[PDB]
Amino acid sequence: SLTFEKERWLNTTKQFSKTSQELI
Amino acid sequence: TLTEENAEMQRKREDLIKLNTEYRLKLKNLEKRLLEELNNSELMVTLNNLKKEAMNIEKKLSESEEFFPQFDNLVEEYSIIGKHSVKIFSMLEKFGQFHWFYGISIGQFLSCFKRVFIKTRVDEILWLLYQEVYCQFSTALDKKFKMIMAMTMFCLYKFDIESEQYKEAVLTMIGVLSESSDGVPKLTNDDLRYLWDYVTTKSYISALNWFKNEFFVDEWNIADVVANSENNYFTMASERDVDGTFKLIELAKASKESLK
């Protein structure tokens, strides 16, 4: 049941880069 | 017009309001659920179901992003009507300069643009806009100015719909009628030949009202304006050598209202 939470955390750490780019 | 005629941004506006509310509320709920998970690091099944609903909804809304180019295409499809309305409002504003009593407000134009559809889709809505604005603004202009406005509406329609040779024919017919350009107009039906014969026979107003009736087919008197009206305030004007009380007396007799 923790696979979905792990995937959500992985997706957050993935799109952190696009968050930084579309932050600046 | 895109939220009322085609309802395009009507359903897109309710959809984007729902999407922005989903963004804000689901960001807050994700923060709260992550805080609860940190506190937790029955309930497990509910949290997993909510997470699955969240990722399914986010996936669907991300796949919905490809409809935005279609939305922009549909928005920019209705822009010729915008340019035409800008021309119409400019002509309203400039007929506020030939005389001191023919001013125009933006709210009246908004009211008539709502009332055009409150009661070739682009061509049909454009025809409706021209017809309704002429019907609602023919009553504030005297005979010369009303005839001028009708001719301008007809010429704008026939130049932004028809070809260039008809446009040149209309320009040279106007120039001949103005006694300015001495050049024989080129005709493209019997109506133009009849007009040429009439200006040869020194008859003008017959063919001018023939063209006017060719453009618009519905007339609107003062009774029609006061009948289909929203505000309770009306202003009547005229020239000094012409009275207008007896027309209101006849209207009150017909409408059975106590005129004082």
Side-chain angles (χ1 to χ4, degrees), chain A residues 1-2 11-24, chain B residues 1-17 20 23 26-30 33-34 37 43-44 46-48 50 52 54-66 68-82 84-92 94-104 106-107 109-114 116-117 120 124-178 180-189 192 195-196 198-200 202-211 215-218 220-227 229 231 233-249 251-252 254-255 257-260:
Chain A
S1 42
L2 304 187
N11 213 29
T12 312
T13 44
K14 275 166 199 165
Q15 272 92 23
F16 162 69
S17 62
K18 205 59 69 161
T19 308
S20 77
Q21 295 203 341
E22 296 184 348
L23 161 72
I24 189 66
Chain B
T1 193
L2 276 158
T3 199
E4 191 276 331
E5 155 70 44
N6 219 329
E8 169 64 22
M9 64 182 73
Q10 171 53 72
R11 75 275 191 187
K12 187 38 56 193
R13 165 205 312 281
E14 70 201 2
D15 281 341
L16 69 90
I17 279 162
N20 296 13
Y23 281 157
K26 280 203 171 192
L27 205 54
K28 185 177 180 180
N29 285 344
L30 272 171
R33 288 191 45 217
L34 190 150
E37 272 283 325
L43 275 179
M44 151 195 288
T46 303
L47 285 178
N48 279 116
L50 287 191
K52 279 149 204 178
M55 45 78 67
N56 271 355
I57 277 179
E58 276 191 351
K59 180 250 293 180
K60 277 172 154 182
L61 185 61
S62 54
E63 294 160 330
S64 85
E65 287 318 293
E66 277 84 4
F68 283 171
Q70 315 310 306
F71 180 75
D72 276 322
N73 205 325
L74 272 174
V75 164
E76 63 87 20
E77 182 177 358
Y78 289 164
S79 67
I80 177 66
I81 188 72
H84 280 135
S85 85
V86 170
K87 284 169 170 182
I88 294 321
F89 201 86
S90 82
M91 171 290 306
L92 265 299
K94 185 266 289 182
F95 281 100
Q97 299 298 108
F98 276 99
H99 194 269
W100 43 83
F101 283 159
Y102 291 72
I104 183 54
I106 175 170
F109 199 79
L110 280 194
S111 296
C112 75
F113 174 71
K114 176 101 192 182
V116 68
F117 210 61
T120 52
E124 283 316 301
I125 190 65
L126 193 153
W127 172 281
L128 272 175
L129 176 70
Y130 281 168
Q131 189 82 267
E132 208 266 356
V133 70
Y134 174 72
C135 288
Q136 196 263 327
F137 279 151
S138 309
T139 197
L141 267 64
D142 58 342
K143 195 185 307 303
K144 292 174 187 286
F145 275 84
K146 178 187 74 173
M147 196 90 180
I148 290 158
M149 182 179 72
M151 184 62 72
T152 60
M153 291 315 80
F154 169 75
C155 82
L156 264 177
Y157 197 63
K158 292 322 178 187
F159 302 161
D160 272 335
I161 292 300
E162 270 78 7
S163 79
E164 197 266 335
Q165 51 95 32
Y166 205 48
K167 171 174 173 67
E168 189 64 38
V170 172
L171 270 295
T172 185
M173 281 285 217
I174 281 180
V176 167
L177 199 79
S178 64
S180 296
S181 81
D182 189 75
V184 173
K186 36 192 177 297
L187 73 164
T188 296
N189 46 358
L192 296 174
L195 167 52
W196 170 250
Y198 291 165
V199 305
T200 306
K202 308 310 161 196
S203 279
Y204 312 92
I205 197 157
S206 79
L208 274 295
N209 63 68
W210 165 263
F211 274 5
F215 168 66
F216 58 90
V217 286
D218 44 352
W220 292 83
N221 72 325
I222 321 291
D224 274 31
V225 174
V226 73
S229 65
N231 202 303
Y233 276 145
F234 306 88
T235 289
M236 170 145 187
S238 164
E239 67 274 16
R240 297 205 65 255
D241 54 308
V242 164
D243 44 350
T245 307
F246 55 89
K247 275 303 280 202
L248 275 296
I249 289 295
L251 188 152
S255 178
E257 292 294 323
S258 72
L259 180 49
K260 269 80 60 174

